Write a protein that binds this DNA or RNA. Structure first.
Ligand SMILES: [Mg+2]
Ligand SMILES: [Mg+2]
Ligand SMILES: [Mg+2]
Ligand SMILES: [Mg+2]
Ligand SMILES: [Mg+2]
Ligand SMILES: [Mg+2]
Ligand SMILES: [Mg+2]
Ligand SMILES: [Mg+2]
Ligand SMILES: [Mg+2]
Ligand SMILES: [Mg+2]
Ligand SMILES: [Mg+2]
Ligand SMILES: [Mg+2]
Ligand SMILES: [Mg+2]
Ligand SMILES: [Mg+2]
Ligand SMILES: [Mg+2]
Lengths: 223, 66, 125, 86, 180, 186, 155
RNA sequence: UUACCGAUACCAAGCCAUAAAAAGAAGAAAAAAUUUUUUUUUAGAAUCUUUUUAUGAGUAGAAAAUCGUGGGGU
RNA sequence: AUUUCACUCAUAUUAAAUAAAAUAACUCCAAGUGGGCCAUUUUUGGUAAGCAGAACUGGCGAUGAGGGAUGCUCCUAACGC
RNA sequence: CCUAUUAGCUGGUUAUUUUCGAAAGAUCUCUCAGGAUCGCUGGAGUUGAUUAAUAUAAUUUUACCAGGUAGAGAUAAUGAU
RNA sequence: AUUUUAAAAUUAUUUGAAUUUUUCUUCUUAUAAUUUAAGUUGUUUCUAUACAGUACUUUCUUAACCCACUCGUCUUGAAAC
């Protein structure tokens, strides 16, 4: 039994080591990509052309309207997304179908392209996780990696950093990770919304559009 | 007295409480009143097949016995 | 309000009085749940009587404990005292209302021997 | 297992480290970066300036071009208006 | 820096085009400067304008670039002319208004207030068509001409906007509006 | 609030605890529940569930039927969570090893004669706690006469549901709507 | 009040402009099998076998074929529940639906792709990738060919 | 343009109940006294115990668990 | 067409996404209900109506809380302590 | 006295908590103040699911049909003009 | 009464590397302790050297701030003139 325990410990240590390297790699990538974007922009500026950045792959979508006075279609869409309360946020893999769905629920949500730091913050401060036999879940905050290394061991994402990476750049194993994440129960924003009635792109003050960068600020406020 | 003589109001909602239930989709719908002649031919074929199978089984049994 | 004493949290010192028990003598204060369309208590309008609810319940661990921290056990007879020789810290005796003065005294004596608290030792004193 | 607190990963250093093993190294790096004194930074500014000239020029050209385009558009609009009036 | 004073209208250069098709591989790109409160708003405005002018909708085009133009000399007073299209409750109108300001953005901020105030024209109903600095030989509006006068001077007839600390509701002595 | 079905809480549709107060049966369920939970063997769980079930869903399994089921694999032990009844319609009885909740006396006798074994559930557990070399069987469930009145109501076309009638004979439910001659049929 | 078998059919069953006449003689050669999906498109030039108003346009599995008939299992939404309706039609109205054939084509192509993959042992992702976001690009445009835009004045 | 105030909604934590989920047929821990005494506990009730997570509006209505009255056997 | 043999079709990203999708199906027994009313939007009759009559959806009814001074239905938002 | 006649109508219909929770559509009815039967609800139960699956979805993509309302037309047909 | 362990983290030691040359540089070989782990612990007063006091807990009674319409009932809708 002691021997077995020792073996287990060793395995754990190995996993941790592996994780660290992976994390480092991810870090290296992130900065590099950013640098490259800048370089590309510079090149474009130099040589008359334009560089359009890659369309943003994920989208963090925060619900605004609550449960009452909602059409059936929109309710269905919400259910599909997994936003059930007023300020349930969730990551969503931007697609064609997904986009269409969003458009159907556009007036009842905000969304945008989260940004890595914001995502990380969400995962750490607000990231809970479904831990149980399928359809019987229990919303557990992560803290340890063993929590998540169980369910997502198969798919080669142990620990929160891997998950974060997956989220940021819709990886091979994004969907599963997203599913594993219990919908983000956010606060209301500490300075406040402008007006949930009106759209974000309305020239007057509003909220419900695709605030495509500025979502991050909102998230920060309401983390 | 005069009445709300008809409305389809709420009906949809009512329907959607237990979903619009699909038919269960069974592999074998009955061939009861469908194409005669053909279906009797089919029946005959099936019978023949069964007979063949039985004969085979019998043969096997015999072999086992020695 | 909430009535902390130590680990004992009581969520509701006030009794839930029957609606309108204050208005008509015939309506006793014993809680009765208002059925009836238009009740206002049933409908829970601000400013009316509250409805007892399972939210008000005391924590499973401290529930029937008195301010003593001891479960009350009512006792009619010396024999009954004996179950609580092995539980003299967790349970406290109350002597039944119908027990005679001599018998009461005897019970009290027994309790003292056991070190078990008696919550109504003073009856007929 | 009995649920206890839920520890604030972002701050609670130990918890953070448990979560993300690499984190420590990153934090050390950050600290190191923070450490280095302002003289060096100041010096680097000159270098940056030296390196920037071409880029600056390019930027100017771009923005100038944009402005020119706008002006041309305006002129065209004016001409159109004049024509309409005529 | 003062955040009570700011109006957060910026100017954005947006460039976009229709997505290439087998039938039209090399489509035209369109640009514009757009006065908007943020980058996303700017984009949306651009899309709207594309829709209005060309056959082009956000779903069948792509934004090539969104730049953000910061004023080059944000502390030089300039005389800005603007040409608007706006909608009244009764109908639709052009007008040309002039604003002496420190940046295009500032002028536009002024403009929106003025249209809201003077015509009850809300931001939705307005379309800025061009703003350009008018050199003072061609300034047509009298309220701008006056400012352009040689050795400009005037007294300070505004009332004090004391800080909320020293705004106290009981006063020893009846304050004076004259000052000097 | 939260837009959910049944608000959060998960419906479970079946039995929970046996409503029986039969001390032996309670003991049995205790045992098999324990076995289910520890020896997560499926078999055990199934057994537990069947023990919990009501009397109609523990229909009697006939000796003949048992024999038929055992036919292909001999020696292994048929387990039946209900009663096993004897069959006069059988002639010969093979060497059967059967666990059941109840054996009707004659059936038991027959089994004994066959040189077989009647095992109770505790015995089975003792012998085969993971149900190795066992076979769960059920008697005919929807063969009940009550069940013949269920389904589509007689009146709906192509329904083979017995009407609840006082008696049989021409005088009772054999005219209008039962023959083309009296309006319609079925 | 008036719910006859051809009500609300002034346009459903009207033959389209410059397509009167009758069903072409080559339409009777469409091969059908017990399982084919099948549109029901009421050519009202034949009055025999005319399926009801509602089934016009609705597809279904063929469950029965006859001399000149086709039984079609078609779903009908009926208040609280969809149910299977056995619509017996002539061939003139039943047209072979095309949805299934799109799938069929894909299947065929996929088989070939699978074979190719096996030839070389590779993890080819078959499943249709939906229109995702576009990747990064660097689009060369001359400053000559970038037509600046302003809103339009009113007229 | 900021800042603020502002719900039984949101968030964090606690407690109640419901639902489901984990999981369960042997042993010294401490303090106080002065190495030995005294003080409390030293659990194992399956519709039960421990822990977890989510959820909690409600007339007509349905159900379950409780509470009480007159009498019966124990 | 059915049958039995072959050979072989993506699969852990699961033959496009997304899904507190099995809280599902199904059977049984029975309750209450079968006077409705309002709001947007579409709409019929009518000069119109807080009128009569419909459609889609949501409410009220059965529902309090915060706002609309006040208010069965508007806005926010649905309620264990 | 039969007789506590009958009433599709009016009034009333007695403890607590917890849990789930409607309908005021539809068809037939000497029916329109009622009833039956569907619908919606509860309970009971079984088979399932418990394997982040497959069934399944008031959802969307990708194909593929069906349409004749808004619009449009009158130097296209009909009917105005 | 052994997931309040394990590991993470930290301190003081010990072996070997690394390019972020660094009194918080990182990993790892071993060893001890610690808490940032592994949901509040301590110190000092007070109640008090008290047996009920004017303190403490609690009932009632008044005020005060805010709120609160007659319950039952048929009814789409009752505080209803
Ligand atoms: Mg606001
Ligand atoms: Mg609204
Ligand atoms: Mg009411
Ligand atoms: Mg409730
Ligand atoms: Mg009512
Ligand atoms: Mg409401
Ligand atoms: Mg008002
Ligand atoms: Mg009478
Ligand atoms: Mg409910
Ligand atoms: Mg009445
Ligand atoms: Mg029509
Ligand atoms: Mg028209
Ligand atoms: Mg008041
Ligand atoms: Mg009335
Ligand atoms: Mg009333």
């Amino acid at each position: 039994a002691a021997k077995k325990i020792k073996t287990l410990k060793l395995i754990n240590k190995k996993k941790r080591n592996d994780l660290r390297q992976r994390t480092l790699r991810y870090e290296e990538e992130y900065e590099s990509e950013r640098k490259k974007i800048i370089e590309l922009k510079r090149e474009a500026r130099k040589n008359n052309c334009f560089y359009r950045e890659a369309e943003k792959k994920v989208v963090f979508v925060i619900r605004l309207k609550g449960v009452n006075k909602l059409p059936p279609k929109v309710r269905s869409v919400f259910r599909l997304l997994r936003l059930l309360q007023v300020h349930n946020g969730v990551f969503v893999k931007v697609n064609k179908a997904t986009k269409e769905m969003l458009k159907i629920v556009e007036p009842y949500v905000t969304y945008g392209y989260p940004t890595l730091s914001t995502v990380r913050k969400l995962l750490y401060k607000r990231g809970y996780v479904r831990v149980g036999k399928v359809r019987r879940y229990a919303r557990k905050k992560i803290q340890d990696n063993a929590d998540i290394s169980k369910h997502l061991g198969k798919y080669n994402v142990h620990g929160i950093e891997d998950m974060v990476y997956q989220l940021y750049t819709c990886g091979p194993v994004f969907k599963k990770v997203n599913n594993f994440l219990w919908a983000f129960k956010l606060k209301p924003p500490r300075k406040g919304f402008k007006a949930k009635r009106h759209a974000f792109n309305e020239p007057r003050p509003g909220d419900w559009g695709n605030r495509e960068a500025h979502i991050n600020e909102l998230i920060n406020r309401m983390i | 007295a005069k009445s709300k003589n008809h409305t389809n109001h709420n009906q949809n909602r009512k329907a959607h409480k237990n979903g619009i239930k699909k038919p269960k989709k069974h592999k074998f719908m009955s061939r009861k009143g469908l194409d005669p002649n053909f279906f009797r031919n089919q029946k005959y074929c099936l019978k023949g097949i069964q007979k063949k199978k039985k004969e085979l089984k019998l043969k096997a049994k015999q072999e086992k016995n020695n | 309000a909430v009535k902390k004493v130590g680990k004992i949290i009581k969520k509701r010192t006030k009794k839930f009085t029957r609606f309108q028990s204050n208005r008509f003598m015939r309506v006793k204060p014993a809680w009765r749940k208002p059925r009836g369309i238009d009740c206002r208590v049933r409908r829970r309008y601000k400013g009316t009587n509250l409805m007892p609810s399972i939210g008000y319940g005391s924590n499973k661990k401290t529930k029937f404990l008195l301010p003593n921290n001891k479960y009350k056990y009512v006792v009619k007879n010396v024999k009954e005292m004996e179950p609580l020789i092995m539980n003299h810290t967790k349970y406290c005796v109350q002597i039944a209302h119908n027990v005679s003065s001599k018998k009461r005294k005897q019970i009290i004596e027994r309790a003292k021997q056991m070190n078990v608290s008696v919550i109504n030792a003073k009856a007929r004193l | 297992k009995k649920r206890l607190q839920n520890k604030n990963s972002l701050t609670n250093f130990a918890v953070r480290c448990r979560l993300n093993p690499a984190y420590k190294l990153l934090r050390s790096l950050a600290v190191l970066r923070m450490r280095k004194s302002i003289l060096e930074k100041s010096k680097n500014k000159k270098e940056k300036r030296v390196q920037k000239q071409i880029q600056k020029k390019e930027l100017q050209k771009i923005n100038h071009d944009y402005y020119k385009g706008v002006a041309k558009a305006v002129k065209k609009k004016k001409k159109r208006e004049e024509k309409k009036a005529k | 820096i003062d955040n009570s004073l700011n109006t957060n209208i910026h100017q954005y250069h947006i460039v976009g085009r229709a997505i290439p098709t087998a039938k039209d591989k090399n489509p035209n790109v369109y640009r514009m400067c757009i006065f908007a409160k943020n980058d996303t708003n700017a984009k949306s405005r651009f899309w709207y304008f594309m829709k209005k002018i060309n056959k082009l909708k956000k779903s069948n085009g792509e934004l090539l670039a969104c730049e953000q133009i910061k004023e080059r000399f944000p502390l030089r007073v300039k005389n800005y002319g603007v040409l608007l299209r706006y909608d009244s409750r009764t109908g639709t109108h052009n007008m040309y208004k002039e604003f002496r300001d420190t940046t295009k953005e500032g002028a536009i901020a002024q403009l929106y207030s003025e249209m809201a105030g003077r015509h009850r024209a809300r931001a939705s109903s307005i379309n800025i068509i061009r703003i350009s600095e008018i050199s003072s030989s061609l300034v047509r509006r009298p309220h701008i001409k006056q400012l352009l006068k040689r050795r400009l001077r005037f007294p300070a007839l505004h009332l004090p906007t004391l800080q909320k600390e020293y705004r106290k509701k009981f006063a020893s002595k009846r304050p004076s509006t004259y000052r000097m | 609030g939260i837009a959910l079905k049944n608000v959060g809480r998960i419906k479970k549709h079946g039995r929970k605890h046996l409503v029986s107060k039969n001390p032996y049966l309670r003991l049995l369920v205790k045992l098999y529940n324990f076995l289910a939970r520890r020896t997560n063997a499926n078999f055990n769980k199934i057994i537990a569930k069947r023990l919990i079930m009501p009397k109609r869903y523990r229909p009697p399994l006939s000796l003949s039927k048992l024999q038929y089921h055992m036919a292909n694999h001999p020696n292994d032990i048929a387990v039946v969570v209900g009663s096993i009844t004897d069959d006069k319609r059988l002639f010969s009885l093979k060497q059967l090893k059967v666990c059941a909740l109840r054996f009707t006396e004659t059936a038991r006798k027959r089994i004994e004669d066959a040189g077989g074994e009647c095992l109770t559930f505790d015995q089975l557990a003792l012998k085969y706690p993971t149900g190795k070399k066992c076979v769960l069987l059920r008697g005919p469930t929807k063969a009940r006469t009550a069940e013949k009145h269920f389904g589509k109501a007689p009146g709906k076309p192509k329904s083979k549901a017995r009407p609840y009638v006082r008696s049989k004979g021409r005088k009772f439910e054999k005219a209008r709507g039962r023959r083309k001659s009296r309006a319609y049929k079925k | 009040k008036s719910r006859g078998k051809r009500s609300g059919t002034r346009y459903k069953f009207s033959k389209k402009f410059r397509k009167h006449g009758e069903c072409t003689a080559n339409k009777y050669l469409e091969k059908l099998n017990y399982g084919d999906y099948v549109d029901i498109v009421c050519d009202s030039t034949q009055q025999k076998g005319m399926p009801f108003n509602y089934y016009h346009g609705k597809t279904g599995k063929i469950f029965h074929i006859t001399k000149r008939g086709v039984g079609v299992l078609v779903n009908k939404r009926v208040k609280h529940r969809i149910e299977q309706k056995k619509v017996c039609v002539r061939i003139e109205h039943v047209r072979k639906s095309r949805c299934n054939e799109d799938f069929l084509l894909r299947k065929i192509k996929n088989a070939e792709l699978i074979k190719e993959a096996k030839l070389k042992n590779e993890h080819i992702n078959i499943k249709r990738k939906t229109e995702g976001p576009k990747p990064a690009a660097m689009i060369k445009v001359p400053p000559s060919k970038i037509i600046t835009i302003e809103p339009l004045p009113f007229y």
